[PDB]
Structure 1
Amino acid sequence: MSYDIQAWKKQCEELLNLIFQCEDSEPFRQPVDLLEYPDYRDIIDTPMDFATVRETLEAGNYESPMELCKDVRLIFSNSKAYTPSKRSRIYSMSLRLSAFFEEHISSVLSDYKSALRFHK
């Protein structure tokens, strides 16, 4: 529905489903195993992954698509910080998937901002 301040929830659930089904999301689908990778927390202050984002959305624990978008962007900025080399296939996967995410989220954000303006 036009001007729906709830539309983002279904739009983000659908977008997360597309990301999970994309091969480029494979490294980012679950929390980094901090026992397997003991220097991860030396580099990364705030781990994030797509299963955490999907679970938080399904629980109703995001107030706005901005809060969801901040967590997704943290998945990609964490990957850049831990895996900074342009040579890494993991760097390439996060670049491709981040660009996909940013192309799809822009209209979710602008629709929300318009709905919120309407609601006020």
Structure 2
Amino acid sequence: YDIQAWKKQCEELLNLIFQCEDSEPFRQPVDLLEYPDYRDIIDTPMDFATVRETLEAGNYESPMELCKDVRLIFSNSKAYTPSKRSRIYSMSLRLSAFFEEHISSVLSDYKSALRFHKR
């Protein structure tokens, strides 16, 4: 029922994601020189360094907000891909599965802890 525990749990999961070869394309904001149409296609670019910095700045209130930004990384890849068989897109789907598998307990514990706090 620790309502603060999500933050270190998210730091640890981000560390695992950064160790994962599949995160390579998503570690930093898209190179708009190599992809000059990218900002035509994608409204809000997001990457894992921006998520980590936002967390470490104390600018997430909840793991739901972090989860929304990580999901935006994956939806941006899905929107920008020219093919469902693209290398970068395919890396996004495996990394998304990994992230969802690990964030579910972080979300559940947080929401349980806040329900207990408000009981």
| 1:84 to partner: Cα distance | 4.6
Quick one: distance in 1 between partners of 2:115 and 2:85? 44
Q: Percent identity, aligned pairs only? A: 100
Quick one: distance in 2 between partners of 1:97 and 1:109? 18
| 1:92 to partner: Cα distance | 1.0
Report which stretch shifted further, 23-32 or 85-94. Answer: 85-94
The residue correspondences of 1:46-85 to structure 2 (distance < 5 A) are: 46-85=44-83
Unaligned ranges ≥5, structure 1? none
| 1:18 to partner: Cα distance | 0.2
* TM value normalised by structure 1: 0.95
Quick one: distance in 2 between partners of 1:18 and 1:115? 24
Work out the number of aligned pairs and report it: 118
- The 4+ residue runs of structure 1 with deviation greater than 4 A are none
Post-superposition CA distance 1:14-66 (Å, at most 9, x none)? 00000000000000000012233210010000000000000000010001000
Quick one: distance in 2 between partners of 1:88 and 1:60? 35
Quick one: distance in 2 between partners of 1:63 and 1:54? 14
Quick one: distance in 1 between partners of 2:29 and 2:103? 22
| 1:101 to partner: Cα distance | 0.2
The RMSD of aligned alpha carbons is 0.8
Contact 1:43 1:82 in 2 (8 A): yes
What SS does structure 1 have at the residue aligned with 2:60? Answer: coil
What SS does structure 1 have at the residue aligned with 2:105? Answer: helix
* TM value normalised by structure 2: 0.96
| 1:86 to partner: Cα distance | 2.2
